[PDB]
C-alpha cells in the first residue's frame, strides 16, 4: 500500500482511479479517508510527518500545523512545488487534476454532507496562514484549483435549475404528485447553490484576498492566474469590479511573472467584445498603466500589453467606421 501523496507523484494510474478509490473509503469510514486527504495536502508540501487520528479528533488546524512543522524532516529548502524537472512538473499537473476530479466526482452528494468540504477548506485555510512557504504555497494552489472546481459545480447547478424549472412548467401546463416533486427539487437545487457559494466565499475571503498580496512572487501569480480563470468561465458572477480590482491592483507588481499573469488574465476577457461593458470602468481606471506596460522592461510583459492595448482600441467607439455600418444597413 502507498500513501495518497506517493500515488499522485508516481502518476501510474489515472487520477480518477485514485479519486474513486478514495471516495469508496470515504463511504466506508469518513474519518479514515479525511485523515488520508489531510495528510495528502501535508505531504504534498514536502512535510514527512503524519497527522495521527488522535490529533484529527482533538486538535484544531492551528496546533496540527504547528506539530507538522516540527515533523517536517527536511534536508533543504526545497518542496515539491519548487522542484525542477519534468517529473515534478507532471506531479503539479497530477496534483491539480486530483483536486478537480475529486470535486467533480463528489459534486452530486458527498460535497453537500457538511463534513468533507468543511474539513478540506479549514485545512487549506490554516495552511495558507502558515509562515512555512511550503505549506502556504501548496495550499494556495490547492485552494485555487478547488475554487475552479466549485465554479464548475455552480455552473452545473444553474443548468440543472433551469431544466427543473422547465420541467415544472411542463407539468403545470397540464397540483398533483409530480408538481410537488418538482417544487422540492427546485428548493433543493437552490439550497445547493447557497452551499457552493458559501464555500467559494470561504475560499476567496479566507485565502485569496490574503495570498494575492503574498510576499512570494509565484504565490501571487497562482492567485492572479486563477481569478482570471473564474472571470472567464463564469463572467456573469465573477466579471465585475469587485473581482477585477485585484488584477488591476496587481498590475504594478515588481515581478514580471506576476504582471504577465495579470495581462494574460485580462487578455482572455478582452478577446470577447461581449464583455467590454463589464470592463469599461476597469478600462477607464487602468488605461494609463496598461499602455505604460507596452514598454515594460520585461519582453513578455510588453508583448502581452501591446496585444492587450490592441484589443482595447479595436473594441472602442473610435474603431467603428461609418462606411461599414452604412454597408450593413443598405437598401
Amino acid at each position: 500500500g502507498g500513501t495518497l501523496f506517493e500515488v499522485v507523484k508516481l502518476g501510474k494510474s489515472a487520477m480518477q482511479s485514485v479519486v474513486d478509490d478514495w471516495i469508496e473509503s470515504y463511504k466506508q469510514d469518513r474519518d479514515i479517508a479525511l485523515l488520508d486527504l489531510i495528510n495528502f495536502f501535508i505531504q504534498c508540501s514536502g512535510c514527512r510527518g503524519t497527522v495521527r487520528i488522535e490529533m484529527f479528533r482533538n486538535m484544531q488546524n492551528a496546533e496540527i500545523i504547528r506539530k507538522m512543522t516540527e515533523e517536517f524532516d527536511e534536508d533543504s529548502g526545497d518542496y515539491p512545488l519548487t522542484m525542477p524537472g519534468p517529473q515534478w512538473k507532471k506531479f503539479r499537473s497530477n496534483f491539480c487534476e486530483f483536486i478537480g476530479v475529486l470535486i467533480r466526482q463528489c459534486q452530486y452528494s458527498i460535497i453537500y454532507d457538511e463534513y468533507m468540504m468543511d474539513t478540506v477548506i479549514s485545512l487549506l485555510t490554516g495552511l495558507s496562514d502558515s509562515q512555512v512557504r511550503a505549506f502556504r504555497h501548496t495550499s494556495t494552489l490547492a485552494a485555487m484549483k478547488l475554487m475552479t472546481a466549485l465554479v464548475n459545480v455552480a455552473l452545473n447547478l444553474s443548468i440543472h435549475q433551469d431544466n427543473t424549472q422547465r420541467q415544472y412548467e411542463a407539468e403545470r401546463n397540464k397540483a398533483n404528485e409530480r408538481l410537488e416533486l418538482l417544487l422540492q427539487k427546485r428548493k433543493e437545487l437552490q439550497e445547493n447553490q447557497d452551499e457552493i457559494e458559501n464555500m467559494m466565499n470561504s475560499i476567496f475571503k479566507g485565502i485569496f484576498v490574503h495570498r494575492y498580496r503574498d510576499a512570494i512572487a509565484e504565490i501571487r501569480a497562482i492567485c492572479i492566474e486563477e481569478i482570471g480563470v473564474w472571470m472567464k468561465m463564469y463572467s456573469d458572477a465573477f466579471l465585475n469590479d469587485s473581482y477585477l480590482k485585484y488584477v488591476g491592483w496587481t498590475l504594478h507588481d515588481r515581478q514580471g511573472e506576476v504582471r504577465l499573469k495579470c495581462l494574460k488574465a485580462l487578455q482572455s476577457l478582452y478577446t470577447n467584445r461581449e464583455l467590454f461593458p463589464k470592463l469599461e470602468l476597469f478600462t477607464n481606471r487602468f488605461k494609463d498603466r496598461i499602455v505604460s506596460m507596452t514598454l515594460d522592461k520585461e519582453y513578455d510583459v510588453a508583448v502581452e500589453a501591446i496585444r492587450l492595448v490592441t484589443l482595447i482600441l479595436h473594441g472602442s467607439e473610435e474603431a467603428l467606421s461609418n462606411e461599414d455600418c452604412e454597408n450593413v444597413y443598405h437598401l
Binding site: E74, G77, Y79, Q131, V132, R136, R213, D214, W249, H252
Partner: peptide, 18 residues
C-alpha cells in the same frame, strides 16, 4: 534549520504604493 519560513507573509500596505 533549512525549512523555508517567511517572517512576513503578505506585502505590506507601505509598499503597495506602486
Amino acid at each position: 534549520r533549512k525549512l523555508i519560513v517567511d517572517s512576513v507573509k503578505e506585502l505590506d500596505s507601505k509598499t503597495i504604493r506602486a
